[PDB]
Amino acid sequence: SDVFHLGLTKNDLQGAQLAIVPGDPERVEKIAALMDKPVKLASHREFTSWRAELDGKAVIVCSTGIGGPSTSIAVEELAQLGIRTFLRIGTTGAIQPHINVGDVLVTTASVRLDGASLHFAPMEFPAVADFACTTALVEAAKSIGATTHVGVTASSDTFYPGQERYDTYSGRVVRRFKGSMEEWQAMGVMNYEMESATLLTMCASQGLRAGMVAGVIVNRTQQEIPNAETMKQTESHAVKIVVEAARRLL
Amino acid sequence: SDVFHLGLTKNDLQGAQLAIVPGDPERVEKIAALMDKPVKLASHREFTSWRAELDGKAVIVCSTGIGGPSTSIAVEELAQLGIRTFLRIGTTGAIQPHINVGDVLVTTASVRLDGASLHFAPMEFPAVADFACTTALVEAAKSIGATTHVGVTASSDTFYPGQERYDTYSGRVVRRFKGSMEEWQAMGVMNYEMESATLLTMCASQGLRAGMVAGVIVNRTQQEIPNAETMKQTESHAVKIVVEAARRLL
Amino acid sequence: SDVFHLGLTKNDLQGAQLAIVPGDPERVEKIAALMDKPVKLASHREFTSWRAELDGKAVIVCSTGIGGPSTSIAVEELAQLGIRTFLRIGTTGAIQPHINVGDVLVTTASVRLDGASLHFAPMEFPAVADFACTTALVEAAKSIGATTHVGVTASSDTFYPGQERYDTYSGRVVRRFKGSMEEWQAMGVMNYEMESATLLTMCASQGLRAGMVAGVIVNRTQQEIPNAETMKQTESHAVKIVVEAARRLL
Amino acid sequence: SDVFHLGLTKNDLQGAQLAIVPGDPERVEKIAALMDKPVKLASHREFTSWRAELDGKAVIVCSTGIGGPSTSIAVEELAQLGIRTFLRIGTTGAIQPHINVGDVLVTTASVRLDGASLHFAPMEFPAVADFACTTALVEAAKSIGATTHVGVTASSDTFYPGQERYDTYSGRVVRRFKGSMEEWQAMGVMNYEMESATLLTMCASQGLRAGMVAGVIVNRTQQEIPNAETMKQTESHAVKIVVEAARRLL
Amino acid sequence: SDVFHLGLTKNDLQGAQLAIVPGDPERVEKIAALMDKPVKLASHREFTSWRAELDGKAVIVCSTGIGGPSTSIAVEELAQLGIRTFLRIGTTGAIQPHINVGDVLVTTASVRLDGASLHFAPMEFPAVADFACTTALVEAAKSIGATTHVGVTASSDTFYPGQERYDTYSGRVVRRFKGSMEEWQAMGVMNYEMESATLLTMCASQGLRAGMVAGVIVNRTQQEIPNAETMKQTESHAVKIVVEAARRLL
Amino acid sequence: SDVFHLGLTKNDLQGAQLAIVPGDPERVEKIAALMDKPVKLASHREFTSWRAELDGKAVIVCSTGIGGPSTSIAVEELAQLGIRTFLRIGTTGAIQPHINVGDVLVTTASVRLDGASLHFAPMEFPAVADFACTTALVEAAKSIGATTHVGVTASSDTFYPGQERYDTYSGRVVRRFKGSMEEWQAMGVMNYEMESATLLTMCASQGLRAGMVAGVIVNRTQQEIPNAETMKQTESHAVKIVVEAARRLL
Numbered sequence A, B, C, D, E, F: 001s002d003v004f005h006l007g008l009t010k011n012d013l014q015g016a017q018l019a020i021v022p023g024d025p026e027r028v029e030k031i032a033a034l035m036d037k038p039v040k041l042a043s044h045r046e047f048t049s050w051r052a053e054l055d056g057k058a059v060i061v062c063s064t065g066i067g068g069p070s071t072s073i074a075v076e077e078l079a080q081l082g083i084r085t086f087l088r089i090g091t092t093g094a095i096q097p098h099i100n101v102g103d104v105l106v107t108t109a110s111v112r113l114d115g116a117s118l119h120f121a122p123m124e125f126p127a128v129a130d131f132a133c134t135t136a137l138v139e140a141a142k143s144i145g146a147t148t149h150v151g152v153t154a155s156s157d158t159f160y161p162g163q164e165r166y167d168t169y170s171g172r173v174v175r176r177f178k179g180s181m182e183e184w185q186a187m188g189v190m191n192y193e194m195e196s197a198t199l200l201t202m203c204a205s206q207g208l209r210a211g212m213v214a215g216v217i218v219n220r221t222q223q224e225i226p227n228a229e230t231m232k233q234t235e236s237h238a239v240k241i242v243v244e245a246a247r248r249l250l
């Protein structure tokens, strides 16, 4: 093993330079399935790695887990192995009324409501996505006739208080996040996810290209609930979208 | 007579939805003169405004003066009149060895080294440029075919210390900015300018679309003085890219 | 030229060490007109400089434009040129009930609500004015019988949100400033302006003497925008005392 | 079932109130193995739970995954199901020349080099461990004869930059952390780990009891080359410690 | 003398290594009178020191005056003199409804609402008590017989605004502290005092041991206000515990 | 007796509205000894108070103790009693090479390196002295005759690390203050003291008048700890000036 956590080697990558990176290990194989010669590489803790081919070039699909810390370990060690491009494919809840379930969200930059970001660049620095990656995502989305929304995302270190959830044990929200959802909504923020701020900031400040697409499972402002399924349809659409996007970046 | 500083009315814009905002009041005329039916509207303080037409579409060109404060006033009142799209065209200093004077830099998002951006959104909010605009600006630069670079831009509130300049009256740089240039370089920042952080933030926080393009007049690493035509040929050059970009955003 | 922005040479100042600095370039002439041998020197961007003589000694009048950024430029290059004493003179929105429009406010120190100041000194450093300069302004106002108020001033990097104006396009004010006006008021802050903070800080920390005075054109405890007629000789009181003050500082 | 991520019901916990919380999911069964009637509960994402018994009191063992974000979901949901006391057991790298590999570190409070804890309380708030837990841990540790150290530890949101490691892709570390390790050591901080800050803070500020113990696997000041069975032996001792400590907390 | 403020020489200590540091200089004698052979050493400013014997060992008792600044001097200089362990015995205002007047409160760590702590360690560092000292105080309380509460404490640099008291000259409280007491209560913080943050931080970051205990002379949630009882039984009650605790730290 | 720590009733001030506040309770007397009808009022903690008479006017002399915390208390409570003008007389350490021991220093505004000031105003608020108080102090200095310097002083919450002293127990200074002394020096700061930041901020933001004057007792650019005949005269000097400054503010 060349890296400490991912249990992989330079050779193991077969010369890959691009890595699709979901948060859940269970999703790694499904995605890799959409490409040629999908083989499992390794699996330690929350990082399950898989390799595949796309139009001749080899591509890596590895999980990050939840939060920027785990994410920063995958991105770091993956970069050490030759990875230069990172694409985030996830699921998220919309905080905007007009964004409806089934809509895909490409992120241009993120509100750094995390902590790992700061370990790579001062808060002044923008958690900005790579133009190429972002462009590729929007095009791959447009090509698959999807209802796409491009914009800012709020990347929180917590699933509850940072996303102003009160339905909790304490039932309280720290002063800083009290009333913060109305704020982000007013500023146009599209949704809450938990790893883009760290991914985008660490990459954008290290010469690595990153981008992020994400299917909308739920909506923090609507009342209706996901149809007769939730993840399933959209889930697989955003997945096809990121793979397609990967094609125009190799 | 409506807006307080610009001294303009709804009628003066003539239904204009998009405006080009250079920093220098003298560049306003030159840009409007590149379009159809250029007509001066007003000129107060550092805000001189003109109106023109692109493919039958009324377009505004209003200077902002130097810095985020004056820029925030121009943008606000312009939006009070109906503008929803803003394209900034300015001059800039590159801090990367490969970006020589004369190049065109399109800003995806900016390192917030100002103060006005904080009057619109907390530091954690990304001073990110609207996608459409950025896309239009990149394409336009590729149309006229110019050496172009896309990435982050450090937007300083000062021309000297903020951009780590030691050849000044006092010659000292406050701790926060000492060594900062090598940092921004190490992080791949492309250049220094003085209004993008405020422009991009106030717009992404209020539903306004904004793009940022700039011509390199100096390279903080290289050793040379404005050739002759240098800032002049550069300026008339980027002035074409942005107008050509706006054309795509009308 | 000797400097990059103002387009002046030390010779143009004729040994002048004091400069009266208005924000609006269209007042440089009006103010120089109250002194002897007024001679225009230049006009670049929002930097319009005129030279004159007071008691046989030369004095400079040069605009700074709106906000600390353009101001930091003006002061610096002007200081490189030889000015050691700067007296700002401007318009201002009072936030106290008793302060009437037309009254002159002398600023002892400013509430740093800008960004340029941080480029010269960490926030802990007071945006305090020079004692001699303040004294001269205070006494000049006494020998004129002008309704004078001297105290703390809030220097904002924006004219709208920063000064908590709600009559805007979005109509909202970021958290940092919601309810911020009544807070300053409770603290006895006299007014709102947009350059004293960065001016007083950059001077206080670089061996430069600075003074600040302004004429009240609107009372924020009544309205956000004035309807009041700007220029016969109403707020001229501020100018008269800034000249009379300069006279003493030569 | 009662929570969104863990996939548990209060019934599955059967009255348990104290949970041991390691990072690595594989150590959960191992911890449970040293207790009575242990049984697998559920496994979702990096959240692997097991329930066991001690002195006829039910105990829970749940993994938190790497980092505060992941941990904050486990702790909150564990608390929703009735857990009041949390004991984290983990691996760590000492920064003190006197703290050797294999030694056992008990944490009184952590340096908050994370972001999630802020989502529960402002920085001024101490990421401190409960006194009872800390006592049980120190006590339990003396009983099986380990070489113990009781103090503060640096809880970082990153494994690389935040722990000032330069053997990385970029080879750089933000200004914020350059020379930071030498400053923690100078301050007496014992080690680096990645979850105590969030755990300790969110518990101490919501009426939950929490403590932490760990074993040293690496010394950032030298070369006690990983003697491959070392992590094995060094871990069994802590695990017995955290269990013995838990016994005194039922 | 060997120090600048205390007026003490190493001889004066007679090999002593522990110090009981009350805030009131008049309490110094009262404390020493619970030991053997009390002897007044010196008195300069708010620094009154006495030496006594505790189970045969030399022990120092030195006042620190109110606030972190005075506290920082005493501890630094006492440390220069040879002291290694500090026990803080003070009075406080309980903020939890369940903590009654006369109760004894031991602090594990404090909320840093002071400024001196930052002169020893960044805000992210915890203001935590030494394990041995806190253990000694918990045991002494039990050996003495008292209602004791162990937990976090709010350490404010002021007695009024920083403790959200409103019956003051101004009757107003700065934004930072509005609704802050209600917030700490929600976080389980049990009380307000004015020197633990400094003491705990400066000791934990410099290798010195520190302990914090105080007597509740008032409860901010009840209308009843104790008469002489404040500096009476409650004071004497906490005074006996710290001396008793001290015996275990020799 | 009307206030909580000073042991004074409003009737005790005999209609006094101005108070001189030295940091050392032992000098209160010496100060009163310079006025008419000096009467000892009380002595509680570091708060020793006296009453005197100047030109048929009541004046109070009350020590505040070292630091903003105890200083904020004395001031607050003295204010509740009727005092609206506070003149502080202290001892300081010159940072500039030209300021000699024995020199009198009047403070215009000070660098806020304290914490109490934050309890009255945000950090951008200037710790600025009252104009009338500063004027009289400067005028009184001309009368008494002394080498005077009027400027910015750094008010530190600590005597050693905050003033970057290395003659300490640890011999090291926290990052924030490493090489901080020559930074203030290069910014023209003239001295280090420990109460003005709190005094000036709390008064200026609460509608109270305050001035600052202090006699230099050491020049840091040549030594860390005080010398030879000292305060015997320096103290008498500054006292003579502050007493004369008080005559001017009645």
Ligand SMILES: O=c1cc[nH]c(=O)[nH]1
Pocket (backbone or CB within 6 Å): B091, B092, B093, B094, B159, B163, B192, B193, B194, B217, B218
């Ligand atoms: O160096 C430079 C050139 C142009 N504009 C800036 O702000 N800086």
Ligand SMILES: O=c1cc[nH]c(=O)[nH]1
Pocket (backbone or CB within 6 Å): C091, C092, C093, C094, C159, C163, C192, C193, C194, C217, C218
């Ligand atoms: O209200 C006003 C008027 C002038 N300048 C400001 O900054 N505010």
Ligand SMILES: O=c1cc[nH]c(=O)[nH]1
Pocket (backbone or CB within 6 Å): D091, D092, D093, D094, D159, D163, D192, D193, D194, D217, D218
């Ligand atoms: O050095 C080390 C070892 C384990 N875990 C960490 O966080 N750091």
Ligand SMILES: O=c1cc[nH]c(=O)[nH]1
Pocket (backbone or CB within 6 Å): E091, E092, E093, E094, E159, E163, E192, E193, E194, E217, E218
């Ligand atoms: O409320 C109170 C009582 C005593 N001491 C404090 O600091 N606060």
Ligand SMILES: O=c1cc[nH]c(=O)[nH]1
Pocket (backbone or CB within 6 Å): F091, F092, F093, F159, F163, F192, F193, F194, F217, F218
């Ligand atoms: O050096 C010195 C002298 C007096 N007071 C201080 O705060 N520092």
